[PDB]
Chains A and B, each alone.
Chain A
Amino acid sequence: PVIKVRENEPFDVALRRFKRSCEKAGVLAEVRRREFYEKPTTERKRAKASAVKRHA
């Protein structure tokens, strides 16, 4: 998720690009996720629950 500011650029465009580069990588999704152990039975259940829902 690495970024620089090239010359004749604002600060505020670089800080925007930082965030649209990090939501594109899913750093924070991939860190929420490993806060707590999920038993595999629970992982499979939530997966099903999403798939059945998204039939809409």
Chain B
Amino acid sequence: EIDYKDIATLKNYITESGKIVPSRITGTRAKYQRQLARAIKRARYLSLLPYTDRH
């Protein structure tokens, strides 16, 4: 279900500064945190999410 196009949802699981957030904090199951981080890492390629907050 979790999906690199869905940049609404992916914003809950990054910072102000566009760092991926750890499962520790968010409470998320670790299967899905793998899928999340992979989603986010594609999103950043396509320029839908940012790497940083310099721009």
Instruction: Return chain A residues, CB-CB under 8 Å to B53.
Output: 1-2
Q: Mark A19-52, 1 if CB is under 8 A from B, else 0.
A: 0010011000000000000000000000000000
Task: Check if B1 is an interface residue, CB within 8 A of chain A.
Answer: no
Q: How far is the CB of B31 from chain A (nearest CB, A)?
A: 22
For B, the interface residue count at a CB cutoff of 8 angstroms equals 5
Chain A residue, CB-CB nearest to B19 = A25
* Interface majority SS (helix, strand, loop, mixed), chain B: loop
Q: What's the nearest-Cβ distance from chain B to residue A52, in Å?
A: 19
Q: What are the residues of chain A within 8 A of B15 when measuring CB–CB?
A: 24-25
Q: Please indicate the chain B residues that have their CB under 8 angstroms from the CB of A1 in the complex.
A: 16-17, 53
Q: CA–CA, A24 to B16, complex, Å? A: 10
- What's the minimum C-beta distance from B49 to chain A, rounded to whole angstroms? 16
* CA gap between A21 and B15 in the complex, in Å: 11
Q: CA A21 – CA B53 in complex, angstroms?
A: 13
* Interface residues, chain A, with chain B CB atoms under 8 Å away: 1-2, 21, 24-25
Can you report 5 A-B residue pairs in the complex whose CB atoms are below 8 A from each other?
A: A1-B17, A2-B17, A24-B16, A25-B16, A25-B17
